[PDB]
Amino acid sequence: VETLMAGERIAEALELGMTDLNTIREWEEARQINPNIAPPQRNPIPAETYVLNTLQKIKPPFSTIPSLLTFLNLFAQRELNVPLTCRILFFVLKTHTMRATLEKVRANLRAALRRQKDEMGFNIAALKVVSMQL
Amino acid sequence: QTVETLMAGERIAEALELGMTDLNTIREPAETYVLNTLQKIKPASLHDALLVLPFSTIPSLLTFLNLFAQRELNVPLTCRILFFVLKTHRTMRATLEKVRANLRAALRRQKDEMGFNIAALKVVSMQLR
Amino acid sequence: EQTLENYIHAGAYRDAIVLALQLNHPGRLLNLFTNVVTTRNPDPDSLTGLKAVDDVLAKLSDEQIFQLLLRLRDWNTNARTAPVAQRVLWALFKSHPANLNEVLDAIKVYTERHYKRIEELVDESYLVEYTL
Amino acid sequence: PGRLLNLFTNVVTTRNPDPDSLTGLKAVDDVLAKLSDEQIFQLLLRLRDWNTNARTAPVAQRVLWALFKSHPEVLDAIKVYTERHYKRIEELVDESYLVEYTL
């Protein structure tokens, strides 16, 4: 029942985040016509870390989803809490044209996963060699 | 008496010379040959076979290995050969980087692919009432 | 007879595969798929590596799907023939929706072992990497 | 030493990092290249301390990876948790296969 309040919490976080992202997107796009501009107007003082933290605070609607996908892909690109992101993608797919965005997100996820998996493989191998050389 | 099995290991060096020269001839199937003569070898002692392998043949061997790796031809054998070449020993470092890269690419390929297949088998079996 | 199949083999792959499915032995079929998958210069858009193979695979009806499935299991048991069978399998799945439990369970069972061996190869390769 | 963890987190979480660099900044790379064999030690002590905890593990792993590419009883304690995490990620991958199939 409190998950409804959590749902409105993440929905609002999505509106705020998407609006801020659009603000900076537009700023940079229009920064190309004249470099000398005032900086953008953001509400609290970024920018995905907010959505992430309000997503991490919860203990374990259709219209809101594309924005969430944008931030999901954004988590994937910045290597931000990958287990949570994977679980989110799996849940979004499990319930509820946008499919291509999902392909994009899963691609970025698989990529992040392979990156850190290989990284840990390397670290383990090194640890084994150096332990052996002791 | 194992030393003659080591010479048997040297038998593939001739295959390498043949394949490489044939490749130069074509530059103006032969990898299947060096490969098959490499697979005809016994699983044991090939460590020693590569151990006693001449220095001149190894660049040729590396070329054929990378060719196997990029074409996904018997990936486990290629990996085992690479690890043995490395275990038994500047530009060759680069060649090794290339072959190992193509190898890992092949591995990620077959592993992700088989993951897909396993998941599918699981789902259709589950949806089989 | 079989030589007609052989000339279709000297040319077109669709009927090569259909005919090979219809008539034993599957060795020449295995040869076909092998030459398709292990080719020196394939087609990046294609699944198997050659469009017509994907085509005959998707155009495949129920009986051919089941038979070729059986042969896929068979080829899968042998570690030298496993890769090819795996690519063909993956392609077939990508071309047909989630529309006997025996062959599926068997294929799953051998495939999982294969996946394991590949993981092992990946670890060994991590070692190969740090040494370099 | 906590703010150390903070900075290490920031340099690897950058909005857009310098390519062809371990951590992501050639400066701190140059730093990890040069330590005093009793600095590196304290560093990997903290790397153990952080690797123990899940949320801070990937950063410690990045630092450890950068460190492992720079040089020739405690390494055990790192190894065990690192392998645990490796398996966790492997599980995540199996799930990734399911997800990949559904669409």
Domain residue spans of chain C = 1-132
CA-based R_g, chain C, Å: 16
Experimental approach was X-ray
Report CB contact under 8 Å: A122, C123: no
Q: Please give the single-letter amino acid code of residue B8.
A: A
Contact B16, B64 (CB under 8 A): yes
Among positive and negative, which fits the CA dihedral C48, C27, B106, B61? negative
Resolution to one decimal, Å? 3.7
CA distances from A92 to A106, B66, C79, C98 (A): 12, 42, 38, 21
State the alpha helices, DSSP H only, in B45-90.
Answer: 46-51, 57-70, 75-88
In the DSSP assignment, the letter for residue A40 is P
Strand ranges in C20-120 using DSSP code E only, listed in sequence order? none
Residue B63 CA from chain centroid, whole number: 10
Kindly list the residues of chain A whose beta carbon comes within 8 Å of any beta carbon in chain C.
Answer: 118, 121-122, 124-126, 128-129
Q: Which residues of D touch B115 (CB under 8 A)?
A: 93-94, 96-97, 100
Contact B123, B82 (CB under 8 A): no
State the nearest Cα–Cα gap between A75 and chain C, in angstroms. Answer: 27
In the numeric block, which tokens belong to residue A42?
Answer: 């953001």
Report CB contact under 8 Å: A123, D64: yes
Report CB contact under 8 Å: A120, D98: no
Which of C68, C102, C72, C66 has the alpha carbon at shortest distance from C87? C72
Please tell me the distance from the alpha carbon of residue B79 to that of residue D52, in angstroms, as a whole number.
34
Range of the domain at B3: 1-129
Strand ranges in chain A using DSSP code E only, listed in sequence order? none
Report CB contact under 8 Å: C104, B107: no
Report CB contact under 8 Å: B119, D100: yes
Q: Which residues of C touch B71 (CB under 8 A)?
A: 38, 40
Burial class from Cβ neighbours inside 10 Å (0-12, 13-18, 19+) for residue C75 reads: buried
Report CB contact under 8 Å: D94, B123: no
Contact B37, B12 (CB under 8 A): yes
Dihedral angle over CA of A111, A113, A119, A121, nearest 10: -120
Residue of D58, D65, D102 lying closest to A93 (CB–CB) = D102
Residue C40: what are its φ and ψ, rounded to 5°?
-65, -35
Contact B54, B17 (CB under 8 A): no
